[PDB]
Design a protein around this ligand. Structure first.
Ligand SMILES: CNC(=O)c1cc(-n2ncc3cc(Nc4c(F)cccc4Cl)c(COC)cc32)cs1
Ligand SMILES: CCCCCCCCO[C@@H]1O[C@H](CO)[C@@H](O)[C@H](O)[C@H]1O
Ligand SMILES: CCCCCCCCO[C@@H]1O[C@H](CO)[C@@H](O)[C@H](O)[C@H]1O
Length: 348
């Protein structure tokens, strides 16, 4: 067991192994409190996330366990991977905080969009890597649920990682959200992530948020103006008469031509945007289909787009006591095994 030390940053107390040094706050979030740190043992800067009140309620406790299970499973070049998990607690009875450690990426997608207008080649590489990481996530039967520029980060080589997963089931931007998640459809496809990819791609191409809604209804207003009011084939899948009547009541809007909306963009990029930003989620392109799209010809390698090991999420169906959730989380903390040092990290 390492020795821990305590320290106050922006009004939150941080207790961490002495290996972590120079803690600097990166952000304060609904997800948790995040601080940049330097790891003396690896010589590498790290991002440390402290779980906010992990066991305050059954919902928070299950969510804590969900996040730890998720992140422990993720081993992919374009997905956040866990370098460390720890708690200052010496026993389960004392267990009340969880800290998660990952490599610190150089920049957020939002910072990159502000910093420069991306080249089409840069857009192809960044979106290719999101879809590559996404193929892996969906292969484990996981929906990320919260792809957005601040959950995407790159290094100096524009190598990209997908970060914090959406932990809601059954403060937080609605701009990249799929319309069905807002409308409470309740049987979400993995395609909701593809809708979020399409929103991000548009923004990388134009420099501007595609759908910057001011509130919930405005968000859907802006979406329908681009993709149009729902088609007959979609109206067939909606049971409520009142919901159908309201859509019929709305002034009919034709889907806008993407070629005009994204004019000056690569035509292949516009074609791919059309296949992502479809209202009907059954008709959105999948991550694996999108990686074979001609727009990614320069980067596509069918033999280097790996898939995930099976992910046991039978826990999602459990209703357990708060003490069981806390206890299962503690077991996962105890059993965590750090990944090995990279070859590039060692010498002769
Ligand atoms: C110079 N560098 C910069 O400015 C930036 C670096 C990053 N960056 N790099 C890695 C990273 C990981 C997380 N989440 C997290 C974590 F901290 C620890 C464990 C697990 C997880 Cl999911 C967050 C929080 O996202 C809301 C931001 C992160 C973003 S801007
Ligand atoms: C008031 C106009 C809102 C339009 C929202 C679309 C209606 C979505 O409503 C959804 O329809 C699904 C299929 O019938 C059902 O399975 C879901 O329970 C229901 O929420
Ligand atoms: C009609 C109000 C505007 C929102 C349109 C979103 C339609 C998304 O598409 C829907 O996704 C559902 C799963 O979430 C599927 O069950 C439906 O079959 C599919 O049509």
């Amino acid at each position: 067991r390492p020795t821990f030390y305590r320290q106050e940053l922006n009004k939150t107390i941080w207790e961490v192994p002495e290996r972590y040094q120079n803690l600097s706050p990166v952000g304060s979030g609904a997800y948790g409190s995040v601080c940049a740190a330097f790891d003396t043992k690896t010589g590498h800067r790290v991002a440390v996330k402290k779980l906010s009140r992990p066991f305050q309620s059954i919902i928070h406790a299950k969510r804590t366990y969900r996040e730890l299970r998720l992140l422990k499973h993720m081993k992919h070049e374009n997905v956040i991977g866990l370098l460390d998990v720890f708690t200052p607690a010496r026993s389960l009875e004392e267990f009340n905080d969880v800290y998660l450690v990952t490599h610190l990426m150089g920049a957020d997608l939002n910072n990159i969009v502000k910093c420069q207008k991306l080249t089409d080649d840069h857009v192809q590489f960044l979106i290719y890597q999101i879809l590559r990481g996404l193929k892996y996530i969906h292969s484990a039967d996981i929906i990320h649920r919260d792809l957005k520029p601040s959950n995407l980060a790159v290094n100096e080589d524009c190598e990209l990682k997908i970060l914090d997963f959406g932990l809601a089931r059954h403060v937080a931007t609605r701009w990249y959200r799929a319309p069905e998640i807002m409308l409470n459809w309740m049987h979400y496809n993995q395609t909701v992530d593809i809708w979020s990819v399409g929103c991000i791609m548009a923004e990388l191409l134009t420099g501007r948020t595609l759908f910057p809604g001011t509130d919930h209804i405005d968000q859907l207003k802006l979406i329908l103006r681009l993709v149009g009011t729902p088609g007959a084939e979609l109206l067939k899948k909606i049971s409520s008469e009142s919901a159908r009547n309201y859509i019929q009541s709305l002034a009919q809007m034709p889907k806008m031509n993407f070629a005009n909306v994204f004019i000056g963009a690569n035509p292949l990029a516009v074609d791919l945007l059309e296949k992502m930003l479809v209202l009907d989620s059954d008709k959105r392109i999948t991550a694996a289909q999108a990686l074979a799209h001609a727009y990614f010809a320069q980067y596509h390698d069918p033999d280097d787009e790996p898939v995930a090991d099976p992910y046991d999420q039978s826990f999602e169906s459990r209703d357990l006591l708060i003490d069981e959730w806390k206890s299962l989380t503690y077991d996962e903390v105890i059993s965590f095994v750090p990944p090995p040092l990279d070859q590039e990290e060692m010498e002769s």
